[PDB]
Amino acid sequence: MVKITRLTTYRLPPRWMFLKVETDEGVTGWGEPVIEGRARTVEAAVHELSDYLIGQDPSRINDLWQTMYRAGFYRGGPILMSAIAGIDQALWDIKGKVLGVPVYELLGGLVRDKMRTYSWVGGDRPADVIAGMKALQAGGFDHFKLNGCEEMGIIDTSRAVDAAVARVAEIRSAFGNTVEFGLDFHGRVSAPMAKVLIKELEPYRPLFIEEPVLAEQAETYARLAAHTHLPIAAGERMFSRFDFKRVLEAGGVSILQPDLSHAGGITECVKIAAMAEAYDVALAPHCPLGPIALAACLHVDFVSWNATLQEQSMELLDYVRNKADFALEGGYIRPPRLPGLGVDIDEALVIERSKEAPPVWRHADGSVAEWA
Amino acid sequence: MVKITRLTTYRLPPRWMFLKVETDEGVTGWGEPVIEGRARTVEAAVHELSDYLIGQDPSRINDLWQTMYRAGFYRGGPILMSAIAGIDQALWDIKGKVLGVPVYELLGGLVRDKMRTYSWVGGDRPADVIAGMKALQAGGFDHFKLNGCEEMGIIDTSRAVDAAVARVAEIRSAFGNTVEFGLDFHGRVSAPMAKVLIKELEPYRPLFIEEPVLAEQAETYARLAAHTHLPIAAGERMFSRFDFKRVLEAGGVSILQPDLSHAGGITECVKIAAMAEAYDVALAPHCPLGPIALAACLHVDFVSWNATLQEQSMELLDYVRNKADFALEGGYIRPPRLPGLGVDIDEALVIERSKEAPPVWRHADGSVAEWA
Amino acid sequence: MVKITRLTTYRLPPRWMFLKVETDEGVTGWGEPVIEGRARTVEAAVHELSDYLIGQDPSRINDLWQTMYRAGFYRGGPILMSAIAGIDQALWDIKGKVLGVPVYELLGGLVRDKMRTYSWVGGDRPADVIAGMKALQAGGFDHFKLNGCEEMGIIDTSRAVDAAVARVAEIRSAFGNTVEFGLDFHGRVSAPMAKVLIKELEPYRPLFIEEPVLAEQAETYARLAAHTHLPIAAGERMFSRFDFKRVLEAGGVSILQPDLSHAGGITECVKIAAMAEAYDVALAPHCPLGPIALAACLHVDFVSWNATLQEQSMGAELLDYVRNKADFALEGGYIRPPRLPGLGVDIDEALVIERSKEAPDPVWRHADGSVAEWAE
Amino acid sequence: MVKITRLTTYRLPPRWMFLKVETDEGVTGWGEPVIEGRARTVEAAVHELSDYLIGQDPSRINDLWQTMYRAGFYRGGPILMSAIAGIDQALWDIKGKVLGVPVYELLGGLVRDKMRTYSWVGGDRPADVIAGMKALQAGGFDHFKLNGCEEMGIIDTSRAVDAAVARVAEIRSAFGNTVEFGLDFHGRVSAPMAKVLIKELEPYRPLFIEEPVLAEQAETYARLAAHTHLPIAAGERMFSRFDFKRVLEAGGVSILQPDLSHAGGITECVKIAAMAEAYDVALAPHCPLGPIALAACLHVDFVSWNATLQEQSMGAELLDYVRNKADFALEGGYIRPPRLPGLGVDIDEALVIERSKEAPDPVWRHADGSVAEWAE
Numbered sequence A, B: 001m002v003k004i005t006r007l008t009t010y011r012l013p014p015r016w017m018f019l020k021v022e023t024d025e026g027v028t029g030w031g032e033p034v035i036e037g038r039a040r041t042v043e044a045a046v047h048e049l050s051d052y053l054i055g056q057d058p059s060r061i062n063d064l065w066q067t068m069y070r071a072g073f074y075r076g077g078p079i080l081m082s083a084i085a086g087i088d089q090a091l092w093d094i095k096g097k098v099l100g101v102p103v104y105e106l107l108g109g110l111v112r113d114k115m116r117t118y119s120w121v122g123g124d125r126p127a128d129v130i131a132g133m134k135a136l137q138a139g140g141f142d143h144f145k146l147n148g149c150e151e152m153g154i155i156d157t158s159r160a161v162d163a164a165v166a167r168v169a170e171i172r173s174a175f176g177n178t179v180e181f182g183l184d185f186h187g188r189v190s191a192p193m194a195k196v197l198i199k200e201l202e203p204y205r206p207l208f209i210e211e212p213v214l215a216e217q218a219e220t221y222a223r224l225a226a227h228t229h230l231p232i233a234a235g236e237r238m239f240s241r242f243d244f245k246r247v248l249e250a251g252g253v254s255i256l257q258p259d260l261s262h263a264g265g266i267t268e269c270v271k272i273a274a275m276a277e278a279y280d281v282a283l284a285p286h287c288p289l290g291p292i293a294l295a296a297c298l299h300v301d302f303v304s305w306n307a308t309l310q311e312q313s314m315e316l317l318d319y320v321r322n323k324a325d326f327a328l329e330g331g332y333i334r335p336p337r338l339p340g341l342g343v344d345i346d347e348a349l350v351i352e353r354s355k356e357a358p359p360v361w362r363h364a365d366g367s368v369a370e371w372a
Numbered sequence C, D: 001m002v003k004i005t006r007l008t009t010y011r012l013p014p015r016w017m018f019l020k021v022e023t024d025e026g027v028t029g030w031g032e033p034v035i036e037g038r039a040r041t042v043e044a045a046v047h048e049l050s051d052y053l054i055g056q057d058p059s060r061i062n063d064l065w066q067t068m069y070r071a072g073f074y075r076g077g078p079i080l081m082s083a084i085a086g087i088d089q090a091l092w093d094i095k096g097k098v099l100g101v102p103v104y105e106l107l108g109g110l111v112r113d114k115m116r117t118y119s120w121v122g123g124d125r126p127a128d129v130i131a132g133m134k135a136l137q138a139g140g141f142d143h144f145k146l147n148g149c150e151e152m153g154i155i156d157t158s159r160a161v162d163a164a165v166a167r168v169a170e171i172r173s174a175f176g177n178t179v180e181f182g183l184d185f186h187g188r189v190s191a192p193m194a195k196v197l198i199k200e201l202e203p204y205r206p207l208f209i210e211e212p213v214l215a216e217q218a219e220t221y222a223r224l225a226a227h228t229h230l231p232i233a234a235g236e237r238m239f240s241r242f243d244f245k246r247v248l249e250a251g252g253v254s255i256l257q258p259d260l261s262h263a264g265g266i267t268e269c270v271k272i273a274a275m276a277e278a279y280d281v282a283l284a285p286h287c288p289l290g291p292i293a294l295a296a297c298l299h300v301d302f303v304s305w306n307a308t309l310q311e312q313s314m315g316a317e318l319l320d321y322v323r324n325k326a327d328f329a330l331e332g333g334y335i336r337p338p339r340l341p342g343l344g345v346d347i348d349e350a351l352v353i354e355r356s357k358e359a360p361d362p363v364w365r366h367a368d369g370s371v372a373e374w375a376e
């Protein structure tokens, strides 16, 4: 019997955390929880959950998942589900290594041969965004994600709607319909301005509108979608099937974006994907993170018929020894090749950059602004 | 033990009424109920409710609020809730004075440092409105409220839609998107004309449409909002949480406008604000009244994270000795400073102008027109 | 061109208010708003609304109603609708005297020849209630209203449910199915106890359960009604068609009980009755009041096919202010249509003026000191 | 310009955590988050949130609450809301000490003069529970909370339903309707058995059925409630207004039980209470905790008209950390409002520091080896 022996967390110099699960057989799994902003809390959670893992057979991923989720506390929100997601990724990494195959082979094998990706593109001017997109267009990309919000702060006025719309107008003029781009507001649109903004963006036909407002109610997406032809994307801030069911039942979300490093890992994200397919909703997993999280996302994409686009942030390949496995041709990525998640982690590099490891936005009136 | 000793009402030369609550400790509270149009009835109500106050400890605002609301009669509509609102304001004024702090400090302290205001601007011609707005624009204002209705009487025809739309068109041409304005119909739009009027106003992007029709059903706002990108504002004619729940559940209202001097005062308006936040609806309290009502509104604004805009009618400062506390920089007002509501009332002036204290609109067919 | 010249209000001994509308042709109308508890505020409302009346032709009741309701203010509410109701009753009194017929003849004439009435019966113990019911039974009454609970105190425990049921059981045992009684709870049951109380009352078959809890939500009655076979009655705390439509849409109420003296008078209550008929809801107008409000109720009952039972407070003090006492006599618990022109009450005005000069003028709390919701 | 200077956490014997917020003016606030089971994670959350507090004026409780809730992260959840709750309690403790009054005086003052409490009673067999209830009954208590099931094991068979009912029947037989008891099932009933269990418990009239199953759907409670007259209680597993609104919209819950130590503290629970009042839902705050959480609960109860019953864990260990023990004395099961400024607890800080140095630190499975959902 294989047994889990130790878990180790590593805080890393951007805003990442890796975890390492060791077994008595010398088979080691890697995981990547979301820390962004609550790193000490997530780390503590990982180590508290470690109590259910040490001494246990990591082959029983379902048992361990259920144990962490329901057995010793209330059902998790953003902290606990991130800790679970990280552990789950590592467990799947182990199982694939033990059985000598990529994770997707365990989960029923390939449903596709390659996966379409898209890249976030930044820039201060609209000129800076155009330039970034053109350089990636030379590298075969034709699908992008842009921040929808130009200015620092929320879209609150007709002036602020027009500035964001004009920025998009300039970006679209440089390409016409030769490229596709999604627009990500990070919830930084006021509820009153949401519908006019969405209507004004319609001539420039973005691929989706991601998180226009922050959903207080499940009805809000359905109500927004009724007014527009533009597809709405959401899922980043939802952590389990129980959260996603609410959103799917109301409708109004065209593209679901669960985060593998937040929504309870591979075990739960495969279930979210299958659930979504039954509502005719496409899957586009949220991945602004590192290579381990991206590998996890790819395994879900390669077994789920409804997966359409995979976000990637290509940095992440620093800690990966097998960089070519994640190379992109025409915006497409291939299935991971090595056993487990398919990431050969440079553990020595991880240890060194973890040894040297170290804000609030407000509106004009002094009131706190919701996190981006 | 502090005890309430006397209540006194004062009818004042515009269309205001102040009330004064005296205690045996010499700490005096001020309140401002809505009388507009039924002044003798509201005054009688205040004095009947006085029976629950005389001899009682004013520290127990919650007890007194509940006693006035439910204990001796049916639950209040427009008359009783106004009388309660006036008394409640005075009770809070007392508590703040007793404890030596502004009311917002009692209610959990500041959630913001300053509060954005907007001003009603009148004028017979569209030239007269432009001129009024430009003078306030020199005084730092960029947010306004205009009457939507030009002509005397209701918007009933295509001709009357076009005239109101052309007036707004001329106002917007003078500023472009440099100013924001809301449009207040006082319910003076016929149900059949509401949707065409709202569609015709869309190019001129007002900040909100306030009270377009008078809501017979709770469904009417939801149905209107489905057709437009423009935010709908409502709340003036609703008097308790029980009235507001109905409107919030249906949705369709973007901006809630309870009146502090109608909707049961600070005690109830803080609850309406919190309720609204749970539906992702912004608060913009209705205040076309005097300084006491405005101070009450500010205390709610300064503790409620969802408050966005505060109407003010700057006259009101005549009866206030501490005028600078309500001064406006860039459209922003500061938190009240003095204990209680933060209004030092010129009681001598109130007494004198109360000593010298003194219509029906019809349609063309002779039928009575609903009140504006 | 007849004009209203004056309105005068009178406060009277059984906490009633009468109102008198005079015209320049010498034709006088009487009305009765409900005051229970806010007498000075309702009285002030009546005189404020009088501004819309003095100088106007009282024949335009529809115009005057609409003017009082929507012209100078926000609509509705318990104060304004009670002021409006009393004024509307007097205007109808005038119109009938002018045209020389009872009010029902104006509103399309008789739909029935007599109207079943029923009375409240009180008593400290079940024996006292039984005796009062039997005394009324010897007069031909077989329909009754009783308080659901002994007296003050909210039903919030199993002990309290059980005592309330035991009382009802005892009263039912004395009669079997030979009488009908409705049970008025005055909203004095906590929401957690509502369903068990209703369930435990089922074997004793009350004709209706009236206001078991206070209607916070639109769905409250509908939810209660899905649990029981017992008819739910409500409406005494609703003051306009717009309030009643919500209740009727949701369902849950089998018997609507608008108050003619609270819900905007005859003009509004005939529209409430017609609305109710469309949802197959019976009309049993609320009337624990004086002879003017009762006459107004009768006129609605005599034109509304869905009217089923009329409450009256007669079970002698009601008749004190009326000279035409025989027009309100009861035979087998049935009342005849009013006979004289207008509302059909010959008001002893000199007795009114007399008892008005000598009229003078509480809060209940739980054990923990918190206020209890108002009951009477 | 007062500033927060330091936050310190203390883990204590009955698996409680106390938290202490210090300021530069020497005014100290105490708070009590709930830790049961994830102590290290909640403790880490408190110190992470401390970054938003150190250097700031504690008078801006609304600003600090909103900053902790929405500024640096995704909202909510059982960990963060518990950290926030404990911090919010201490800030309120500070504000009250600064202004020299109990917290309830700040939030609009008393709505009641005393608050009905009730205690959990345990026991291996029904005889043991009866005895414990009788021992408390001699102290004036007539309201109780009992475990719905003997102990661990899910009620998933007719045999298990029958044993649970037989226990309740025996306990009820000893008292008749002379006492009230609520039944806490801790979600330990399978969904297939939920309705029969509730139906079979009906004759013995529990005051409420608390958390019979785990709320998967919004409609779960509403569906259960349509089947029974028994009141359903829930809310201990909900952590914000946004969670509670869903339950209240759907209906099904008669008694809302937010935890002051889990649902974002005083600031949030007063808003939860006000939300509940609008749906006519009673407030019975969850509090199996220490004296700081209890005091926080009391302040909400004393300003919220809809508050009905306050749980306490007193039925001596609670009072161990408090020097002002008399302020929490019970008479007829009623507690008085807290007397001292702030939360009204005089914390034996030296006793706290002492017992904190000596604090040290399971998973249940079905017969088939699968994990059982967490219960306590």
Ligand SMILES: [Cl-]
Pocket (backbone or CB within 6 Å): A075, A076, A077, A078, A079, A080, A081, D077, D078, D079, D080
């Ligand atoms: Cl969590």
Ligand SMILES: [Cl-]
Pocket (backbone or CB within 6 Å): B075, B076, B077, B078, B079, B080, B081, C077, C078, C079, C080
């Ligand atoms: Cl009223």
Ligand SMILES: [Cl-]
Pocket (backbone or CB within 6 Å): B077, B078, B079, B080, C076, C077, C078, C079, C080, C081
């Ligand atoms: Cl009213």
Ligand SMILES: [Cl-]
Pocket (backbone or CB within 6 Å): A077, A078, A079, A080, D076, D077, D078, D079, D080, D081
């Ligand atoms: Cl959390």
